[PDB]
Ligand binder design. Sequence first.
Ligand SMILES: [Mn+2]
Length: 395
Amino acid sequence: ASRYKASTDYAKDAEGLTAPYVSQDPQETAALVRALDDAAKKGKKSGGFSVKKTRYAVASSPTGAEVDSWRFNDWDYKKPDLPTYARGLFTTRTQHGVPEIAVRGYDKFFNIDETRDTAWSAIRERTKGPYELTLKENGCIIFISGLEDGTLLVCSKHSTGDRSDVALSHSSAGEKHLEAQLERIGKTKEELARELRKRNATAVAELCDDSFEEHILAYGPDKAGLYLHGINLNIPEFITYPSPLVQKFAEDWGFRKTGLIIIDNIDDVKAFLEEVAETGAHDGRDVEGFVIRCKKSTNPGVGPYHDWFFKYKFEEPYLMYRQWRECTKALISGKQPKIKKHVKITEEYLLYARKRLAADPKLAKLYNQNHGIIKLRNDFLEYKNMKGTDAANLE
Ligand SMILES: [Mn+2]
């Protein structure tokens, strides 16, 4: 029962939905900031969860605006009573002195079985549908929101602007894609900034482009850009747009859309995902995973029903691809490649990569920082006349 196809045509059928909207309450915001500030302090006896606070200056801002970036230790999201479970999280102060949340990412979410809420029996017991299955595009996260002075603010996970630590920051690369996107549709940055603040919202995109930072699936000049997969309200709890409205927003401001499947029964979700994982491909395309969005309650009884995510990552051929990338990277340096799984095909792939790497050295260094990764992978894939799925089950 894989006769669910991914679609990016929901947008205009989103006509009957209203996007969630709540205004920020400055007392509760300022209360969150003192909770994070106390977690950011390194000598206390109590308050057992740590945060790192990095302010950031918004270079493009006329008010001289600044934002603080809040980063938790990864394991703290598995503790109860965090002041917020937002992963990316930026606060600021309006030019009229009001404290605000500038950027609110998703709640930290986990893969199946990596926590006890992500066990299949638990998802079947505490969640409620319809389950939204969104394509997990493979890139780097970008946050976009609008400040009170009209500044359009572009963040990566945890950072914004230019840093003395990298050659071109993720957020700058993202901001440059956003500028091209808007001019192509005759809209400007301040209109997007004005819009996102009007919705009290952070836009959540995946930046996917091999010219910048190539991951495990390819994004050429054709595919490159920002894929929109979420809009969240800039408030302490997690309230997110249903995906049809995200697709409508993507269409109104030029983002690439994230594919969506809605499945009503959770047993159909589980049967679906495990069926796609036998090939790692869907509808002719290869896919690293789905993000499943749905509603969950703390304990299945009286009380909550908050928006909740879990990931389903497809386990092959992608582990093989990783091994081929790390083995190719190992063989450019003075280190023997490690072969852990897929021994027979991996030594065939290494056999061929060595022929092409000795032919021109200029391949051999574009692979340190990664050019040619998928190209080298797909070149042998059909040198041997194989889809990566078939190579992965040669064993
Ligand atoms: Mn990712």
